Scaffold this motif. Structure first.
Motif, mmCIF file in Angstrom:
data_model
loop_
_atom_site.group_PDB
_atom_site.id
_atom_site.type_symbol
_atom_site.label_atom_id
_atom_site.label_comp_id
_atom_site.label_asym_id
_atom_site.label_seq_id
_atom_site.Cartn_x
_atom_site.Cartn_y
_atom_site.Cartn_z
ATOM 1 N N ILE C 88 0.848 -1.175 0.000
ATOM 2 C CA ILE C 88 0.000 0.000 0.000
ATOM 3 C C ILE C 88 0.889 1.232 0.000
ATOM 4 O O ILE C 88 1.814 1.343 0.815
ATOM 5 C CB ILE C 88 -0.970 -0.004 1.196
ATOM 6 C CG1 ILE C 88 -0.236 0.079 2.527
ATOM 7 C CG2 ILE C 88 -1.825 -1.256 1.172
ATOM 8 C CD1 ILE C 88 -1.061 0.704 3.569
ATOM 9 N N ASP C 92 -1.157 7.438 0.043
ATOM 10 C CA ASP C 92 -2.608 7.253 0.022
ATOM 11 C C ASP C 92 -3.231 7.315 1.411
ATOM 12 O O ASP C 92 -4.447 7.509 1.526
ATOM 13 C CB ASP C 92 -2.953 5.907 -0.615
ATOM 14 C CG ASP C 92 -2.960 5.959 -2.122
ATOM 15 O OD1 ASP C 92 -4.002 6.373 -2.686
ATOM 16 O OD2 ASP C 92 -1.926 5.598 -2.735
ATOM 17 N N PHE C 93 -2.435 7.125 2.463
ATOM 18 C CA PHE C 93 -2.958 7.101 3.817
ATOM 19 C C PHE C 93 -2.262 8.117 4.711
ATOM 20 O O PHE C 93 -2.676 8.301 5.858
ATOM 21 C CB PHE C 93 -2.857 5.673 4.393
ATOM 22 C CG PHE C 93 -3.520 4.625 3.509
ATOM 23 C CD1 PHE C 93 -4.858 4.287 3.687
ATOM 24 C CD2 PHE C 93 -2.819 4.032 2.460
ATOM 25 C CE1 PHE C 93 -5.469 3.365 2.860
ATOM 26 C CE2 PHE C 93 -3.421 3.116 1.627
ATOM 27 C CZ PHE C 93 -4.745 2.780 1.827
ATOM 28 N N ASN C 209 -14.776 -4.078 0.005
ATOM 29 C CA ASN C 209 -14.592 -3.143 -1.101
ATOM 30 C C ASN C 209 -15.481 -1.908 -0.977
ATOM 31 O O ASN C 209 -16.663 -1.943 -1.319
ATOM 32 C CB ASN C 209 -14.850 -3.839 -2.440
ATOM 33 C CG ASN C 209 -14.230 -3.099 -3.610
ATOM 34 O OD1 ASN C 209 -14.138 -1.872 -3.604
ATOM 35 N ND2 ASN C 209 -13.800 -3.845 -4.621
ATOM 36 N N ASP C 211 -14.970 2.791 -0.500
ATOM 37 C CA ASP C 211 -14.010 3.947 -0.368
ATOM 38 C C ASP C 211 -14.710 5.192 0.176
ATOM 39 O O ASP C 211 -14.496 6.314 -0.290
ATOM 40 C CB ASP C 211 -13.258 4.362 -1.659
ATOM 41 C CG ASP C 211 -11.992 5.260 -1.384
ATOM 42 O OD1 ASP C 211 -11.964 6.017 -0.408
ATOM 43 O OD2 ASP C 211 -11.006 5.201 -2.155
ATOM 44 N N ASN C 213 -14.120 6.164 3.250
ATOM 45 C CA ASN C 213 -13.262 6.722 4.291
ATOM 46 C C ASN C 213 -11.876 6.068 4.173
ATOM 47 O O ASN C 213 -11.534 5.498 3.155
ATOM 48 C CB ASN C 213 -13.883 6.541 5.689
ATOM 49 C CG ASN C 213 -14.017 5.073 6.100
ATOM 50 O OD1 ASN C 213 -13.113 4.262 5.856
ATOM 51 N ND2 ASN C 213 -15.127 4.731 6.741
ATOM 52 N N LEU C 214 -11.096 6.167 5.264
ATOM 53 C CA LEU C 214 -9.702 5.739 5.185
ATOM 54 C C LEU C 214 -9.539 4.280 5.599
ATOM 55 O O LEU C 214 -8.621 3.590 5.119
ATOM 56 C CB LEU C 214 -8.850 6.664 6.045
ATOM 57 C CG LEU C 214 -7.374 6.354 6.103
ATOM 58 C CD1 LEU C 214 -6.618 7.203 5.095
ATOM 59 C CD2 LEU C 214 -6.932 6.652 7.499
ATOM 60 N N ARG C 216 -12.157 2.005 5.086
ATOM 61 C CA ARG C 216 -12.672 1.294 3.914
ATOM 62 C C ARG C 216 -11.573 1.135 2.873
ATOM 63 O O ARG C 216 -11.360 0.041 2.329
ATOM 64 C CB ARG C 216 -13.891 2.021 3.332
ATOM 65 C CG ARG C 216 -15.088 2.053 4.275
ATOM 66 C CD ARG C 216 -16.283 2.804 3.720
ATOM 67 N NE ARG C 216 -17.435 2.735 4.619
ATOM 68 C CZ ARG C 216 -18.699 2.970 4.254
ATOM 69 N NH1 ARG C 216 -18.969 3.272 2.994
ATOM 70 N NH2 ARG C 216 -19.693 2.897 5.145
ATOM 71 N N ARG C 217 -10.822 2.205 2.644
ATOM 72 C CA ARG C 217 -9.743 2.178 1.669
ATOM 73 C C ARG C 217 -8.672 1.182 2.083
ATOM 74 O O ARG C 217 -8.202 0.377 1.266
ATOM 75 C CB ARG C 217 -9.177 3.601 1.530
ATOM 76 C CG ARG C 217 -8.112 3.802 0.478
ATOM 77 C CD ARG C 217 -7.489 5.162 0.673
ATOM 78 N NE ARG C 217 -7.536 5.988 -0.530
ATOM 79 C CZ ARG C 217 -7.881 7.270 -0.548
ATOM 80 N NH1 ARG C 217 -8.220 7.890 0.579
ATOM 81 N NH2 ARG C 217 -7.863 7.930 -1.691
ATOM 82 N N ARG C 220 -10.042 -2.636 1.664
ATOM 83 C CA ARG C 220 -10.142 -3.068 0.269
ATOM 84 C C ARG C 220 -8.762 -3.211 -0.369
ATOM 85 O O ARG C 220 -8.408 -4.284 -0.907
ATOM 86 C CB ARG C 220 -11.009 -2.067 -0.499
ATOM 87 C CG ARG C 220 -10.939 -2.135 -2.010
ATOM 88 C CD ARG C 220 -11.598 -0.895 -2.638
ATOM 89 N NE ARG C 220 -11.004 0.337 -2.126
ATOM 90 C CZ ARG C 220 -11.365 1.572 -2.460
ATOM 91 N NH1 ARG C 220 -12.345 1.789 -3.336
ATOM 92 N NH2 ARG C 220 -10.719 2.598 -1.915
ATOM 93 N N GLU C 221 -7.957 -2.134 -0.296
ATOM 94 C CA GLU C 221 -6.648 -2.090 -0.922
ATOM 95 C C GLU C 221 -5.629 -3.008 -0.265
ATOM 96 O O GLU C 221 -4.609 -3.286 -0.896
ATOM 97 C CB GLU C 221 -6.105 -0.648 -0.950
ATOM 98 C CG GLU C 221 -7.015 0.439 -1.591
ATOM 99 C CD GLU C 221 -7.467 0.123 -3.027
ATOM 100 O OE1 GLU C 221 -8.528 0.647 -3.448
ATOM 101 O OE2 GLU C 221 -6.793 -0.666 -3.733
ATOM 102 N N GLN C 300 -16.732 -0.072 9.703
ATOM 103 C CA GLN C 300 -16.347 0.832 8.625
ATOM 104 C C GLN C 300 -17.221 2.084 8.577
ATOM 105 O O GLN C 300 -17.380 2.702 7.522
ATOM 106 C CB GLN C 300 -16.361 0.099 7.289
ATOM 107 C CG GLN C 300 -15.467 -1.114 7.314
ATOM 108 C CD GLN C 300 -15.136 -1.640 5.949
ATOM 109 O OE1 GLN C 300 -14.507 -0.955 5.172
ATOM 110 N NE2 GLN C 300 -15.530 -2.871 5.658
#
Ligand SMILES: N=C(N)c1ncn([C@@H]2O[C@H](CO)[C@@H](O)[C@H]2O)n1
Ligand SMILES: N=C(N)c1ncn([C@@H]2O[C@H](CO)[C@@H](O)[C@H]2O)n1
Ligand SMILES: N=C(N)c1ncn([C@@H]2O[C@H](CO)[C@@H](O)[C@H]2O)n1
Ligand SMILES: [Ca+2]
Ligand SMILES: [Ca+2]
Ligand SMILES: [Ca+2]
Ligand SMILES: [Ca+2]
Lengths: 304, 303, 301, 304
Positions: C88, C92-93, C209, C211, C213-214, C216-217, C220-221, C300
């Motif tokens: 990751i 992105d975070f 899966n 997106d 919020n952070l 959820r992201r 999924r990712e 989530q």
């Protein structure tokens, strides 16, 4: 000592080969040819030309690959000229002679050399598509090689093709990283383009590329002439240095940093040597013994 | 129809070999090994195991490479077992023989077979590392092959659904790419993993992989157990279908689409592949004769 | 419910942890880190990442060991990507800030924990190298622990192969130390076969899966690589253990009581000898598949 | 020389301690006790005894673990008694006083010693459970130890308590194999049990464990009575020879072989010695100087 060389013979590869030929201590067992500076077809011819001028027309030659592992082939590099080595004439050297070449792919050949040559060192002066495929086919063969002396990867940033990359490894980043994650980095030594620019000689302060008296000296100057101009009138020994260090060892080392390397095969920087310090990684040389490099280069071109 | 198979012999690779062994219009000219689902060594072992459960030991078997080209090797012992072949015991099948192996690399030997062996075909159930490396060494050799039947991808085209993960091309996308750019995609047929997943069976409802009557039935029945129970109790023909179309020609296809595959060797999705409706592309099969395929599954398991 | 966690932080671990961050009846007291799915330092980084994306890293993260007890550190695990957490991008975070790590060894801090933290429970989502070495140094303290919730084991008995099991085969001596020291009666066990039997089909299920919020992201990712690697299936190996550990018998449909021992020789070293036993382990066989996915979704928000 | 002792206080453990103490040149910086011949409760009590009997009890004592790593306690025939050291009466020594133990766990004291104090050495006379766990928890600090001296194994066929292995290693072969594979065998020296049978003494012809006079003689004599009986009447002094080597260097060793060692963690041979001629492996001492061993045994008990 017993050495196998894989080359994309442009000017500087031929000069390096002369280095290893000049030293009696050094047993050249094979030469392997990859495309790069010049086309594989020309690199075979150029190595023929050099073995001819030195007079050691006995070492075997193998044709490897004519392309990178995955990346597409680019336009024929004119960096070394049409013939790929200062565009010399074969009547101006007497090199107008049938060439020599085996029947085994340089991959097949080098694998054989690794299975059969006790204390075999390799000297990799080119894009490493050969050695990478060689590792992937018969890894248990290649890893027997006593040591790896490789030229490539500009790790301090500034390079030759891209803004901060390096020609040989950018030519096949996949081939390089195959090497780096397959062959043990502790048993390899790396000559970077940055070490080639850091030891770059001024063209009008040094003369060992402008002599006469024998065909060796004539070769050296007329081959090095067209590239001396491409580096803006400076001598950037990328391969001659890889070779000098390979064959002399500890009176070539001044300060070489132990580092682990990796290639970047994703992004716009596809071809960057990236490095992280480790004592169980590559010994990449950062400075040279310059006075002794000059003094051996001047040795081989004598006629005595 | 002469034919050369490359395999990461786990469970479906095995049955897929048996498909090509039952039909006496095929001549397996040789079998080649690549580290895929299992270690390379196990793949060679399992190739022996199926050739012995058939009793046709005179096919040559060739070692290849042990990992994919640049990607990590990523064996899946949770799906195929540890041995690669469902963890079956060889004293249950009379398969505790020493292993026939050749002293040549599958890459040299495939280059040789491409050169010396008229109208030869290839069926690839594994990552295409060996094939890429042979295309890089002697492409003039491998491009004599009259046809390639490859198992990989997760195509959409006219349909609109892509699931998650394919094995064979997510494992060596470099190898798939080398192949897709060096061999004429118009001479290529493609059984997707999506073709597998859309041709599922609920193992309760059909019976073709739990039958007892011979030695090849006992083989298939206990080999298939773990991956069946791991795929959701579901039998998803991913390798068998490759072979089922690769010998039964246009007499086993229902809906074939022509797209120009393009493996993604960069970005977030490095395992996925792109494609577009191209006439000069590969022969991506969407649907197949499911009713006729199960019949060959039954008809090879006879006494 | 006070609860110390040991993890070799991979993708499953992280969301097993988030199960616990999202429950206001749970108070995680420490995270101890082991070299399992990735080398130890990657594990510290991904525990810091998980806590950050959840947003409260005031829970000390202790370092354990970088090898099994006696087994040759071998077989580099890149299943979970190079960083152990699905590769990751930290940009992105916004989690490319420095790491929190305490100075004590996870074993000693484990021991101080059970020596001072009352009714403390344990959740072991990794090879048990840390836990077993604490068992040898100071059992009189660790036995104060009131329950053990361990992920690992693949009771071969269905057609799931025990070769997908990892936690126990990675350090099987570790498992033996535990199962021959700590009470099998005060121990619940989510197996790898349990985790596959409760696999979802990805294509059909959507909870991994989103997106909005952070977290959820993050979920999924990170699960993308494990799903594609797992054949397009979600096998909540870690998360199921945390489900059971947090939600008690309300999370269990089916469970046997089995005495357990480790093979440590021969052909199947990391395998599970299991026997019906009144005083055995609570080896879980089936859980409530619904309230699971409910809690996975609820965390989530 | 600055030395750390790890001991399972039986009779010979104690007298080896006495050896490390009779030399004004060997500083004891810690004693880490651990279940072996006798339970932890005993070994702490009995280390205390040896200290008090000698006169210097300033040496810190720490308690290791109560068990092996994976193996159990199995079958112990009290080769050293109920207290694990001949069952002496502390009122014959004035040792019915309180015992000294520290608060830290012997593994933590161990690693701390290895982390700070310089040129530290280890002498292990017990199952290596403590050192194994200390290596796992902190390999980088235990690797700061200059040298290891360990009594364990029987590279020759038979054993002491096992038809094949030796007590200190058969007792916890996992810890054994841990230290053999995690600490450099070249900085390690081994006192085999077979070195203790070969270098044994017919007690019917040798007297150094039968002397009266000072308490040192009283202690040695009365502890060694039982275990000499159990060992056929011979004196097989494993730990005293280990300490002989660790304290008194090479003039203690007459012959030695360098062999790479390994633990059968499987089969009928569970716990068994494994060796192989390797120049950078371990240093298994075969034939010790039996003459100076008895000299320094007599030098310890001297009236002075
Ligand atoms: N003098 C230059 N600019 C130049 N151009 C190409 N090269 C080749 O690149 C590698 C090092 O970059 C060497 O192997 C050289 O053959 N060097
Ligand atoms: N879904 C996967 N790809 C997968 N397979 C194995 N694991 C790891 O094995 C342990 C369970 O035994 C987990 O907790 C993880 O650490 N993860
Ligand atoms: N069975 C015996 N003759 C015997 N006597 C003593 N021991 C102990 O075992 C190790 C010997 O290697 C020593 O360190 C002692 O502690 N064993
Ligand atoms: Ca070059
Ligand atoms: Ca396959
Ligand atoms: Ca885990
Ligand atoms: Ca002892």
């Amino acid at each position: 000592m017993k050495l196998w060389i894989d080359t994309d013979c442009g000017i500087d590869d031929a000069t390096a080969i002369l280095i290893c030929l000049a030293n009696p201590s050094i047993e050249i067992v094979g030469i392997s040819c990859i495309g790069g500076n010049a086309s594989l077809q020309n690199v075979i011819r150029n190595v023929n030309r050099t073995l001819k001028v030195w007079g050691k027309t006995d070492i075997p030659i193998f044709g490897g690959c004519q392309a990178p592992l995955v990346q597409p082939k680019m336009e024929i590099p004119h960096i070394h000229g049409g013939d790929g080595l200062g565009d010399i004439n074969d009547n101006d050297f007497g090199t107008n002679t049938p060439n020599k070449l085996e029947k085994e792919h340089a991959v097949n050949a080098l694998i054989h050399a690794a299975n059969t040559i006790e204390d075999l060192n390799i000297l990799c002066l080119a894009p490493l598509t050969n050695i990478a495929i060689a590792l992937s086919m018969a890894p248990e063969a290649i890893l027997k090689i006593k040591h790896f002396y490789i030229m490539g990867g500009a790790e301090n940033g500034k390079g030759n093709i891209t803004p901060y990359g390096e020609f040989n490894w950018r030519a096949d980043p996949e081939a390089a990283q195959i090497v780096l994650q397959t062959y043990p980095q502790y048993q390899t030594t790396i000559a970077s383009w940055t070490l080639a620019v850091f030891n770059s000689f001024n063209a009008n302060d040094y003369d060992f590329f402008n002599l006469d008296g024998n065909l060796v000296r004539r070769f050296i100057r007329e081959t090095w002439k067209p590239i001396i101009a491409f580096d803006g009138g400076r001598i950037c020994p990328a391969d001659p240095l890889a070779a000098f260090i390979a064959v002399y060892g500890d009176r070539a080392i001044k300060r070489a940093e132990r580092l682990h390397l990796s290639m970047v095969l994703e992004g716009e920087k596809l071809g960057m040597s990236l490095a992280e310090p480790d004592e169980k990684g590559c010994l990449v040389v950062k400075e040279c013994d310059a006075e002794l490099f000059v003094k051996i280069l001047r040795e081989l071109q004598d006629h005595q």
